[PDB]
């Protein structure tokens, strides 16, 4: 009956408690603090006329794609603040965007339950739709390219699906969440990915096998953002209860919590740095926060914006940080 | 700038043309009147005369109207309702022939309290529709005034928004009333933009 499930859930907690010998508070005591760090808006990206919910950095750390409610995808240069491309979307209700690792495609999705892939390099000189993905009952919230012809999508129907662009059909379907799935993050080796849901829980998936490896709890509110550590052995979680925390895949625990009494708003986007000792979180009180990510102490504030910060992103070389917001502006910090 | 090459100048020209196209599209997108349709409840009857997000288009006196139906989104509204922050007006449909049964009236008032006092639709007006009138006639004016006032008082921010109420007026009144409410909302919006208030 259901007694075995309760006993197994109790014993997995007992096994979890048998490994927590030292939390991530006493291990890092002799380490020098980062200290106060200041970033200035090197570039401001104007051209959007509505709320921005998603931005993605290119692989070359120069190009950038952003989405907004005006039915527009804009590709920026970010060095000379030019606009490489402007892609009009059929559905103006978009909440996610992606950039292919090869630089040949971009993806978008939202309330229309449709993931669209656009070809950026055609002989005709214009960007056109290459494939449309259908099969999600709920609205899509995140999409990330695995390779040139493989994408993973997260929707609001408590499911995650692995697609094949060539045939336009679901290759693998990931099920097991009891709430709306909000965020996705791909591992550096592109063999695993983590998923955040509105059931206050996140779990690790396997792309090849197609089944969940482990699940992580601890939050008491819906998860909004997720991202791995650069080494791929850890990931950070953002939720609406003003708390960010870090989980370890090998330890299957929660390491440190990044919270403060002055903050009561929710976290919308998170992102690490190149070395991993700088976690950046976008909050709902109109300013980003910069965290030590190893001592749970704030070390910077990005207060340039005048509305809710919705998306964050660092470059692959770590040279800059791009943030979007609900005031239709993107700012490059360095 | 004298420090640019020829290709950089051509790229800047392309970026300027993109900017011009974006402005010329946003200008045309600022003449759409954005309506969000809600209910529980006769919404089909309200749209009859004139998968994800549903839409509808119709023209009345040179105004182009967008309606949105959210009955097909079987998910919690706390995640995607902020996408509609900025609509001209919110249409709300309530059927009067549910006062004595098990009670849809209490659910309707709870939904109204949740949507009228929402933290995002603080400055968005609410167009309120009493759909059922023939069925409600069976088991009058005092009761209708009572129900109207009862639905009216839930407005917590009683200064920054107005709740226009109709009594659908079987034919053709439904559109005209929305046109009058949209014109009034636009007029009062401009005074806020210019500071004339």
């Amino acid at each position: 009956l259901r007694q075995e499930a309760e006993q197994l859930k109790n014993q997995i907690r007992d096994a979890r408690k048998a490994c927590a010998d030292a939390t991530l508070s006493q291990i890092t005591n002799n380490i020098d603090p980062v200290g106060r760090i200041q970033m200035r808006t090197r570039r401001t990206l104007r051209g959007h006329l509505a709320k921005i919910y998603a931005m993605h950095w290119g692989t070359d750390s120069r190009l950038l794609v952003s989405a907004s409610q005006d039915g527009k995808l804009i590709i920026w240069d970010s060095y000379t603040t030019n606009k490489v491309h402007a892609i009009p979307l059929r559905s103006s209700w978009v909440m996610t965007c992606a950039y292919a690792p090869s630089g040949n495609y971009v993806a978008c999705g939202g309330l229309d339950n449709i993931c669209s892939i656009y070809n950026l390099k055609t002989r005709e000189g214009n960007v056109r739709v290459s494939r449309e993905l259908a099969g999600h009952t709920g609205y899509l919230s995140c999409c990330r390219f695995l390779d040139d012809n493989q994408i993973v999508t997260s929707s609001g129907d408590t499911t995650c699906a692995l697609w094949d662009i060539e045939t336009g059909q679901q290759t693998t379907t990931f099920t097991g969440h009891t709430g709306d799935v909000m965020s996705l993050s791909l591992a550096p080796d592109t063999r695993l990915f983590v998923s955040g849901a509105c059931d206050a829980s996140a779990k690790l998936w396997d792309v090849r096998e197609g089944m969940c490896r482990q699940t992580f709890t601890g939050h008491e509110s819906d998860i909004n953002a997720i991202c791995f550590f650069p080494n791929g052995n850890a990931f950070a979680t953002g939720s609406d209860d003003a708390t960010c925390r870090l989980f370890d895949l090998r330890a299957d625990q929660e390491l440190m919590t990044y919270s403060h009494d002055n903050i009561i708003c929710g976290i919308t986007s998170v992102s690490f740095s190149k070395s991993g000792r700088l976690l950046l979180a976008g909050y709902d009180d109109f300013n980003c926060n910069v965290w030590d990510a190893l001592k749970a102490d704030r070390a910077g504030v990005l207060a340039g914006h005048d509305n809710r910060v919705s998306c964050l992103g660092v470059t692959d070389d770590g040279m800059a940080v791009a943030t979007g917001s609900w005031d239709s502006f993107l700012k490059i910090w360095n | 700038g004298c420090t640019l090459s020829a290709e950089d100048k051509a790229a800047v020209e392309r970026s300027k043309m993109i900017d011009r196209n974006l402005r010329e599209d946003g200008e045309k997108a600022a003449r759409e009147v954005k309506l969000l349709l809600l209910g529980a409840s006769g919404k089909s009857t309200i749209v009859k005369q004139m998968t994800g997000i549903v839409e509808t288009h119709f023209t009345f006196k040179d105004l182009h109207f967008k309606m949105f139906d959210v009955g097909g989104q079987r998910s919690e509204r706390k995640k995607w309702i902020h996408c509609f922050e900025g609509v001209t007006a919110i249409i709300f449909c309530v059927a009067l022939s549910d006062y004595d049964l098990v009670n849809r009236m209490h659910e309707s008032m709870k939904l109204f309290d949740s949507i009228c006092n929402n933290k995002w639709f603080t400055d968005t007006s609410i167009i309120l529709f009493l759909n059922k009138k023939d069925l409600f006639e069976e088991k009058y004016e005092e009761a209708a005034a009572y129900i109207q006032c009862q639905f009216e008082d839930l407005n917590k921010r009683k200064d920054t928004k107005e709740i226009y109420t109709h009594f659908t007026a079987t034919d053709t009144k439904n559109v005209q009333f929305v046109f009058d409410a949209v014109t009034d909302v636009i007029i009062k919006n401009n005074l806020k933009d210019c500071g004339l208030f």
Epitope: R62, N82, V84, H85, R123, G125 | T3, S5, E7, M17
Partner: single-chain antibody
Framework: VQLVESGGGLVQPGGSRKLSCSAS????????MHWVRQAPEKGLEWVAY????????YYADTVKGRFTISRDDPKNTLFLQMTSLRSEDTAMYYC??????????????WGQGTTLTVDIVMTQATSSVPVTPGESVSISCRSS???????????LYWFLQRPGQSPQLLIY???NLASGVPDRFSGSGSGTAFTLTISRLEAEDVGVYYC?????????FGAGTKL
Amino acid sequence: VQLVESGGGLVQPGGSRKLSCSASGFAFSSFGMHWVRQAPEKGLEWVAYISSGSGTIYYADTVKGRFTISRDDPKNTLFLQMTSLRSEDTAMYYCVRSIYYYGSSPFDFWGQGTTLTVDIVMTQATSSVPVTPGESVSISCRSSKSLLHSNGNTYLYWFLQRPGQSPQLLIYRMSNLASGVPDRFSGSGSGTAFTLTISRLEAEDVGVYYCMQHLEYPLTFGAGTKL
């Protein structure tokens, strides 16, 4: 992607003649268009240029004033108005499409060509090289000044013109390889001296090779090396 040209023929000196190019198969409204002419003697000479939005127009300092370039984006047609034609205007005229953003190929497609009968210096010391297939060849050309801009771009382009055929882009910005070109070709250089290296030469590599600069208008071509 196909450009068809018309307007050529025989014209008496001192007259006028209009050339038209009909674009088809691509978004002509987002491409800048050049005109490049070729005399019966081996060589190339840039003539004019019109921007994507018709806001920028350039000419070479030899036909400026008497030549007019125009486009009609509704009709997808490019025009070149020529007046007071001299005896030195007998050339084979080509239409070249151009798009300019970060990472684009500005001289990828050339037209079929039309015939009419009536500054930085790029030099190519080599004129002809006898060679057999399967042997690697090196083609080098020098520049009057350094082509490396401060932003890191070396504006050098490479073109191959097979006999009885239109020129084709091979290398753009002196490093990158054009699409549809086999990886046998390779480009290299440093500031002033540049070289083009071809490995495993095949029977389709015969032709004349030109190196073109794009640092500042007017654009200047090389002499041409025959293989």
